[PDB]
Assembly symmetry: C3
């Protein structure tokens, strides 16, 4: 996969996802939602999309990833939508691992308006 940028790491073959990094320091008070820039652009492989999902180490602090879908044709900078749903302030440091990207297959079906059975 072609990438451009400094915020995504090669993964081990036994891991599902690539680490995504914060491109700058981010402060999140309780309740705050911010789009965290990663500095990364990429060319997803044809036939696939990208799921941005939490790291367990980050989720255990009460930070959540909102949204999560990178469409095959998305070519701009990846932002991770992060919310502090905990009741303690958190600071994410520049270059800290904040989420992971997992590549999954796409399925395209026509929608047919009819009668749902069963």
């Amino acid at each position: 996969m072609i990438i451009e940028g400094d915020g995504i790491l090669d993964k081990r073959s036994e891991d599902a996802g690539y680490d995504l990094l914060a491109a700058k320091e981010i402060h999140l008070l309780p309740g705050e939602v911010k789009v965290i820039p990663t500095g990364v652009k990429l060319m997803l492989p044809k036939g696939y999309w990208g799921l941005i999902i939490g790291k367990s180490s980050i989720g255990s602090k009460g930070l959540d990833v909102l949204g999560g879908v990178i469409d095959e044709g998305y070519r701009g900078e990846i932002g991770v939508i992060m919310i502090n749903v905990s009741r303690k302030s958190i600071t994410l440091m520049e270059r800290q691992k904040i989420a992971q990207l997992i590549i999954l297959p796409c399925k395209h079906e026509v929608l047919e308006q009819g009668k749902v059975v069963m």
Copy 2:
């Protein structure tokens, strides 16, 4: 895919998911969780399940999708469980795009009670 109902849109082939729409206007104060009706029933293709996941435009407002799994055999009306985890009230308008549905493959394995290695 056979659908019945007015709250799901055809997608571009370069997009992962189908937009899901609110079937009525929904108000969410901070902290409120509601099951938002979409008015949609569908027949998932055999061998697949449906992931309901957030839209980036909605997640950036601090709304989250809870749950997310539509099982292949589910034939009733799709509801999107939405929570306002932000600290500002939000109104979702009738027919607004509130989430997306992505079709993913199913894997069925027997569970065997034994000794986990490695």
Copy 3:
């Protein structure tokens, strides 16, 4: 799939995921995040990872699953990171169904630093 432990249930072939159970009673005040033990270890099938995602019955109460990725090589006890993002206290009972595990395919790609097109 080889499992070791008392907190994961066989699934119907028409369901996407396996139920995960709380290994002990858990109290969550509003805003609290806890790693809920399941008592389960497993050997994911090679070529796959495990997505821990919410049950609709649990998500409708305003509990969310944070994180969610079990990597193919993970052999320790599965913990479900659960947060009460609602404004009502909740108690999860011992052996209650708290989340589901869905097995999904892995995709491994090399990252190539270059110029993103299109």
